[PDB]
């Protein structure tokens, strides 16, 4: 329901806004000197651009130009099938699994050294308290 839409906004020309078109504007037409320049260059054997050569020296990896019906319209295409490399071990990561909940080194490291240090401090204080309790229990 997008095609063949209705006129949604109004069209208008504000008072005394200029148009910059004369009465022969419909008979005016554009022109480019590029075709004539190309013909003259070809006829006089003037310096050609490097786009006439399909090989590409502008990089280290091999590129070849693909032309769309004309030497003026080209795209470079790389030839290599590049090999990629990973200095990574396999099977060392399970991102779907939440690791903050599992008990272990991997879990603490998916958590932080800060949480682990806090846990160790609480551990030490708890051990102090329980040592005091042991002392008073066994002195009796």
């Amino acid at each position: 329901s997008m095609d063949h839409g209705m006129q949604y906004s109004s069209i208008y020309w504000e008072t005394s806004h200029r148009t910059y078109l004369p009465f022969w504007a419909s008979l005016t037409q554009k022109f480019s000197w590029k075709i004539m320049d190309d013909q003259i260059r070809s006829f006089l054997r003037l310096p050609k651009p490097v786009t006439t050569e399909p090989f590409v020296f502008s990089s280290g990896s091999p590129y070849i130009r693909r032309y769309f019906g004309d030497a003026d319209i080209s795209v470079p295409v790389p030839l290599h099938a590049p090999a990629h490399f990973a200095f990574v071990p396999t099977g060392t990561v399970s991102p779907w699994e939440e690791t903050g909940m599992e008990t272990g080194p991997q879990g603490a490291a998916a958590r932080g050294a800060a949480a682990t240090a806090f846990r160790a401090v609480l551990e030490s204080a708890w051990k102090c308290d329980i040592d005091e309790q042991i002392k008073e229990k066994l002195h009796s």
């Binding site: 903050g100 008990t103 958590r111 800060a114 949480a115 806090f118 846990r119 609480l122 551990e123 708890w126 051990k127 329980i130 040592d131 309790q133 042991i134 229990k137 066994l138 002195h139």
Partner: protein, 90 residues
């Protein structure tokens, strides 16, 4: 590290203490004491680590979150520790 192991550690501690006596216990029974305390500490961290991480998180966020409102963030941890101790040492 398990509750069973920690209980056996504390039984070792108490029986070796009854063997030694009230005068030379702290001298003779240091290694068993450290082992028992380390096992109890492992148990405590395992059973009360969620509450400690929650307190840590509230402290990072300045106790601005919903779960940080009130005193439950502290009372839960203290209750876990008290329960663990009452389960282990006696």
């Amino acid at each position: 590290m398990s509750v069973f192991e920690a209980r056996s550690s504390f039984l070792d501690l108490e029986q070796c203490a009854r063997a030694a006596g009230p005068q030379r216990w702290e001298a003779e029974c240091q290694g068993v004491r450290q082992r028992a305390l380390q096992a109890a500490a492992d148990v405590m961290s395992r059973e009360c680590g969620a509450y400690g991480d929650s307190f840590f998180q509230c402290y990072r966020h300045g106790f601005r979150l919903e779960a940080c409102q009130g005193e439950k963030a502290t009372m839960q941890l203290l209750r876990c520790q008290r329960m663990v101790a009452d389960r282990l040492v006696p």
